[PDB]
Amino acid sequence: ITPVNIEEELKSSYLDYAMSVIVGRALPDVRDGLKPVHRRVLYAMNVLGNDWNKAYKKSARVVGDVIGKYHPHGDSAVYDTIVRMAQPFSLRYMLVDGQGNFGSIDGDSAAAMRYTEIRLAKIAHELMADLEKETVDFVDNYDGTEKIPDVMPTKIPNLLVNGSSGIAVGMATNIPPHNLTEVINGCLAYIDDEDISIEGLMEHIPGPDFPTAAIINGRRGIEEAYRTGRGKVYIRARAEVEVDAKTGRETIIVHEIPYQVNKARLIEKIAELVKEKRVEGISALRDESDKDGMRIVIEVKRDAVGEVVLNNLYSQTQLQVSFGINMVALHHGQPKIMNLKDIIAAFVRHRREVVTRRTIFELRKARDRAHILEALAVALANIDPIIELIRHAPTPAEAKTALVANPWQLGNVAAMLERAGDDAARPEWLEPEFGVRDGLYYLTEQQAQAILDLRLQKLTGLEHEKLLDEYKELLDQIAELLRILGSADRLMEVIREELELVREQFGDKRRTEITAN
Amino acid sequence: ITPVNIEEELKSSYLDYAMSVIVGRALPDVRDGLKPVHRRVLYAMNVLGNDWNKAYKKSARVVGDVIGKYHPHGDSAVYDTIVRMAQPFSLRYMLVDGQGNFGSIDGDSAAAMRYTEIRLAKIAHELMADLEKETVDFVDNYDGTEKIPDVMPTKIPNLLVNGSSGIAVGMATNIPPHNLTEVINGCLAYIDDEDISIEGLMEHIPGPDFPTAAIINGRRGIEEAYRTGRGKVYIRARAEVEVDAKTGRETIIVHEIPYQVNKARLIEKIAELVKEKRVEGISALRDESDKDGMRIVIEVKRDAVGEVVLNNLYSQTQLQVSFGINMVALHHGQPKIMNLKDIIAAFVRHRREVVTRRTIFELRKARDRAHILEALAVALANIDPIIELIRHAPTPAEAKTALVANPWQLGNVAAMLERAGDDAARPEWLEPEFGVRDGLYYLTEQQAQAILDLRLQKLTGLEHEKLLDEYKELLDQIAELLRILGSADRLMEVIREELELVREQFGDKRRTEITAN
Amino acid sequence: GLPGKLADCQERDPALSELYLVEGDSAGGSAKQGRNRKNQAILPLKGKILNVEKARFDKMLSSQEVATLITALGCGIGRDEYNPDKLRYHSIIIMTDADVDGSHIRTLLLTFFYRQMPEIVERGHVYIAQPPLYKVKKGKQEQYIKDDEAMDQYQISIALDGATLHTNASAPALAGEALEKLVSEYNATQKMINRMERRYPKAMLKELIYQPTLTEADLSDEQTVTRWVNALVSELNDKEQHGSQWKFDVHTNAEQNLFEPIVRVRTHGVDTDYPLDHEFITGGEYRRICTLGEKLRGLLEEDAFIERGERRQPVASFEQALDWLVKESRRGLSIQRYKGLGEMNPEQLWETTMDPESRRMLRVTVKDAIAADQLFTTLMGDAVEPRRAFIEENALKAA
Amino acid sequence: GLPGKLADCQERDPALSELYLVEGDSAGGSAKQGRNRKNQAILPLKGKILNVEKARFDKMLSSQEVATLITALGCGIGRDEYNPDKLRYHSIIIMTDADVDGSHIRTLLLTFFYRQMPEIVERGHVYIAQPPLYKVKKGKQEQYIKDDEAMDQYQISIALDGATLHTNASAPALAGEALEKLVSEYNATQKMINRMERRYPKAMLKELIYQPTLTEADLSDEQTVTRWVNALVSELNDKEQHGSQWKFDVHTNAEQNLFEPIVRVRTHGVDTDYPLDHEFITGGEYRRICTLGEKLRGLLEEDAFIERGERRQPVASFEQALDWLVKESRRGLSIQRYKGLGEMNPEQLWETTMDPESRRMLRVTVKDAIAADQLFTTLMGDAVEPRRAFIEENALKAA
DNA sequence: TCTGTGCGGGTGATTTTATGCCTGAT
DNA sequence: ATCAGGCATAAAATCACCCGCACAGA
Ligand SMILES: O=S(=O)(NC[C@@H]1CC[C@H](c2ccc(-c3cccnc3)cc2)N1)c1cccc2cnccc12
Ligand SMILES: O=S(=O)(NC[C@@H]1CC[C@H](c2ccc(-c3cccnc3)cc2)N1)c1cccc2cnccc12
Ligand SMILES: [Mg+2]
Ligand SMILES: [Mg+2]
């Protein structure tokens, strides 16, 4: 029985729990804006083939795959974060299509897992673009035998167009949504000039944009949050007072409500405030929403003034709320408070890494294919001795070793092989012993097996010209990738075209109006 | 608003519910002894590759696959029937291996789905034998796009070696377990003589066998159930009274308990009966089970007799229970009460159908393979004109149409083709225009494409003799299947060898003792 | 008091308000978002309710769902407090799901109203809602199908959209009034054959359509009946694909002078005999397949083809032509079957079920009072023997 | 009264009975089947318990788990009814799971005992159980591994089972005392390099092992330092596989007369400079990789091979030989890591954790009373600013 | 002469803790 | 000046009905 102290048992146990919640549960990354829960759900939907132009699929399959293969943490929490991606009043740009009963703005809950069907949205395919070209890193599971990506190679700037809301041990985050066509313009303005100030970057991005419209009342709290990281804004509902043509009766019509505000609780609170005799001048209260939009009707008494009753409801009911901005995110594995310029500059660096990691993979694949096609094109000009050497061999192993024993003469392909000069198509691992020396060709063990697997229908006069055209196309594609890797202004020229294409395909309009006090 | 009567609305709605529970939920089939819940679980474990000699797999994967693909009825009920297949005190022959915490005989519940690992047992592979050889029928899902087998092609007689327990609308079932080496002997005795009586069939199968041993007290209720279908038996625990060497103190030791009996409730009931002063002579009661088996110690007072106290506990506590036998099962889609001879005779008919459906599939596959190998062997004796005709063709379609335009002469294969006489290797759908006529061979469109897909490494001198040996083996296998399909005593000779092999591989010994009153 | 899960309406006058009974929060959430807020109310239920007939009066009052249903209506229970003029809604609508579990809940809900509040049923305040079952998307058009018979009629009509049956070249084709009648008669005969499988083999009955007919006057000669049975069993061995052997017998009889052929088969090593006696020849089942074979023995020569819209494919049998016509129409087709109200959007549930201008609804009535409560005792009572005999008797009527 | 989920023992004398605290019915069911029935008792818990420091005294007494834990021990709570000599068990053992959620429950359970019943902790009645973490099956033998360091030692020992490093042909090989020391020193240097990645590139630091060493006296000549930096940056371009460009600079200084080389790189179009000043040359980090390189610059000529048991494969570097030696031992190996007590059979839990002859257990003591309750206020208190500064300070110590 | 109870395959619902920042009600 | 609630990922539990057949208790 070895004794321990209570001071070191408490310190060792509490730090193991606190570091796991910060890094592995909450506080999303700054490069893709996703928590570890969301990444595994999107990857499991990507593996199954649940595309946007195919048929719908039941959510029970997706939840079962996520639980059984990637995420061992519970069952009801996985279904709760799926329905947050499908509600139009919850996210600015939705990531799951969804069909069925997914709740309401009055507080209705969603249906069970057996009755709802989901599939990926079209904007969610831009987050997993070029995943199978070795652009990100992969990690293991809890029991091995499966691989999960460490980060996503996104093309769309998340953590700004959507937000974040999480509680950790010692810290928490709160980020509002924005508009896509403004943040893309800010990203292009950073590319054109890297010394852009906060004031020069704020003429493209004026403020936050919410999916429920309404009005932002004031500009002082927005400029403080973009310079420091912390600030406070006010959100106000949209309403008006109208009079009757014949009588002098007045009514109040409410068209929009603030962010994260329930409607039934608001109506119940207004009715309770009338019943307790704290707001005077209200005689009736209904709810006629229909399908054209939102409409709440409040009746005003004849002896009261409709402007004073409307001004009293702003400071007593939940028709004006407050939002506290606090931006923390994981940067190089540790939490950090960031301003607007740090988030923009951490996206272009990720784009640079993704493009320069895709180019090397494409170049290596092209050079391997050209190396195979050279030996395929050589052997079709020496058909009769190849067939004689194969037929005079007892076993295919001795036939394979007889092919590399002697050099093979060229003919009708020397003009093709001289065009690929300056060793631009040779693989990097190839020894200098093999290849084209003098007027003869030297084969390898890999090239000799490709001749023995050649089909008998390749001897026709049609596919040889197809092989020559494929060789020509491979040489052009090899030249362009080297021109991209040669310089840096060409690399920055590739990045701008993708951003303009994203802005063209997924453009939108501003819903929230920003005024002064 | 079309009116309806309340008499015909009640009758139409109640009959739709009642027929679905009888056929689709409870009351297992007589040919394999399985409810529709068990068949989908075993099929989903068979599809995933969860074999008996591989590593364990989490139960969450299996439950997720069963819910998402085959069984749309709930989640907690699927996990409850999995753990009934893994408990050794519940089934006589277990079908799921299992590892972790799966409950106890004292009433402990199993652990959650995240902590347990399961795989198939070795005896469960005999239930799904020869499934992919078109021996059973397949049906659709609730939404299509998947197929589920209608019945299993089992080799082991279920519904007797295990039991059944289900409640339906208007009827219910209750069948006890039996012993495998006795029911196989009864099945062989039915094959040797189809006019075997109940008394002649009962000398091989004396009675039921339970996984918890104990004693069956009486023989009158067993003979009534095997002739009619309904009967009642009594199950008695095993116990004894021992004395001390020095003193005259006596103790009662309990070694075994009856079927479906909890142990903690039994000890609590005995303690309550002592406390309420209804059984006299008991001073102490413990539970020393350990690992060697089961042992319950009851102390007897000095002024009492240990035989009278033991005889009083049989008629008051749950040391003797009753079992009511009632055998109903689905036969041709309708419920029926059956005796012992009907269950045995409904198994041999299933075995006959499975064997005669496997033989036709194997024969058709062998004849198609021999038809391909003939055209592969012909074309290797005419290599030079085949290569010349391929090389003088612009497109592979014109090369394909040039092969069937003219007959091809034979040579070095006429001795092979003359051995396959009397049209024993021709496919049944083959037209009489093609084939071998005079000394020439006529190709089809299917045979001409196999020549164009021939690899270049088949021209060596090694694989031709392999093709000839494969052709010889195919001819012998074609002859044996026709000899099986020709007669019926050969068909019954095939069935007996499999039953003897099953009896040899999965033999056991009797646990329950049958005595008289 | 008032229940907490009830979503009331803005109308306070009775005989203008409606109440809907649904099957949980999954259907209740979808029903509340697509209703009319002025005069429609929703009340969810928590599952299977208590059986009134099997339970006593003391256990009924202590239940939680029954008390909620009693206090929602407001009329009262018992005899001292059963004034039925205090009813709050003059329309009670039952909208359970389209499963077999939804049919069980409707039975318990119907036996609660008849055994406890019979005057509400007698005055006509109880209705039954009918949601659709199938949704069919044919390329760009969507339709809703009520039941299985409408689905069969829809797929037959979409199969027979283009029907140009050419018997031979340079001959006029058949279209319109003849193809539909031929298809309907063939489907009726094929449905009649499948119910006869328990007494005769299925392959033997389909062969009798193309065979020449046998009359009662031909049973007095040996040569005609032995030629007919030999020609019957000659081609059954020719078209056999499952490995069976067919034989025949003459069976000369002395009294009631006739000659009845016998058909012998051996399937899996087991031999059975199927006699064709005088009852089968003069029966009504042979007459239908004889009248079918009068217009099918022939009508298809060599060089015959069919064309639906643009595709021509030669056929040699009527079954092959019908199968090719059916399989061509199932290319751009998707069929979805609903199994609950939580699978539908609130826009879809309003336009098909709850809109008072385009909905279909039933109204329950009582025909005989003596014959009604006798059926409730048999089906929902304590005794199990009349219930088992009632279920078994109706299974024989379908077969 | 007595709790319903407590499984008591047959022993009534204290100082011979033990009590186990577990984490639900999943672990509680497995613990009850494999215990000793005479003197061991099991009490399950329902999840995360209340925080004592953040809650007042009124909310503590109304909790359900805390009341069950109080009435199980039998000593009492408060001050009027806190006689501590009525304790029923003289051994309290905490046996939570091996996750990070099990570490949180142990913290709340430790702060309940110290803040409410301090005399039980001071008299030494509280223990901590230690279940194993890994199960390793090597062909036919099974072993249990306590922690990660024992796992690393086990895999190093199973990699170095056969170590015949041949530098050249017709030469004696190295085995035993030299291979283990070389492997340990190389692993220590590789662990030191990975913590230095935040200030220097990883590919540059690994190249300095095989380069000749640079002394303080060589910094007074331009030619030696420019030859050293040119030979350093010559082969970094040769072995580059990710597309980077390397350059160099001289950086002549006037005061403190020295010559410090500069390394320039361009990775993704971004250029950074890494100076190698006087602090890096005389530092302790360069000394370890200099002492590693004294026994590695050389020692591998042409025609060199390694053999573990029977397999010979030629190598050209020490890293390739070590990787081939490690990868060969991971063929017939299976590793399972436990994350809960419900994953173990009751036979396995008894032989490793609960058997009083082959178990390992800790005993908590208090060293300083003043320094103990100051740490409980910082970590478990209401204020959030000392907690955030305590977490952030210890993250810098590891890096 | 009643009234519970348990066996298996189906339907539906529900409450209590940690961790951080801001509000309203007492 | 103190207390309670609502925002997203994580832990742990429990109770009420239909359906037939035999038995213990009152
Ligand atoms: O949780 S995330 O970090 N942010 C969701 C916000 C938080 C608050 C906001 C919200 C919450 C509730 C309502 C609401 C509730 C009831 C009635 N009327 C409105 C509205 C908005 N919704 C997140 C979850 C899942 C996928 C995410 C993907 N990219 C970013 C964030 C994601
Ligand atoms: O449910 S099946 O029709 N029969 C299980 C019997 C019924 C009763 C019997 C039993 C029940 C409980 C205990 C028990 C409970 C508690 C303590 N101490 C013992 C023991 C036996 N176990 C069945 C289920 C799943 C797979 C099956 C596969 N082939 C046949 C039947 C199968
Ligand atoms: Mg339902
Ligand atoms: Mg745990």
Numbering used by the authors:
A (entry chain A), B (entry chain C): 8 to 524
C (entry chain D), D (entry chain B): 402 to 800
Give the article text.
WGS of the strains showing resistance to compound 60 revealed that each had mutations in a gene encoding bacterial DNA gyrase, a heterotetrameric topoisomerase complex comprising two GyrA and two GyrB subunits. DNA gyrase is responsible for introducing negative supercoils in DNA, a process that is required for DNA synthesis and proliferation of bacteria. Given that DNA gyrase lacks a direct human homologue, has multiple target sites and is essential to bacterial DNA replication and transcription, inhibitors have the potential to selectively target bacterial cells versus host cells.
To validate the presumed binding pocket of LEI-800 on the GyrA subunit, we used cryo-EM to determine the high-resolution structure of E. coli gyrase holocomplex (A2B2) bound to the substrate 217-bp double-stranded DNA derived from the bacteriophage Mu strong gyrase site (Mu217), nucleotide analogue 5′-adenylyl β,γ-imidodiphosphate (ADPNP) and LEI-800. One molecule of LEI-800 binds to each GyrA subunit, occupying a horseshoe-like hydrophobic pocket on the DNA-binding surface just underneath the DNA but far away (>20 Å) from the gyrase catalytic residues. The quinoline ring slots between H45 and L98 of GyrA while the pyridine ring is positioned above I112 and F96. Remarkably, four hydrogen bonds anchor LEI-800 in place with the side chain and carbonyl oxygen of GyrA S97 (to the N3 of the central pyrrolidine ring) and the main chain nitrogen of GyrA S172 and side chain of K42 (to the sulfonic acid moiety). The only inhibitor that partially overlaps with the LEI-800 binding site is simocyclinone D8 (SD8), a natural product that prevents DNA binding to GyrA. However, in contrast to SD8, LEI-800 binding does not affect interaction with double-stranded DNA.
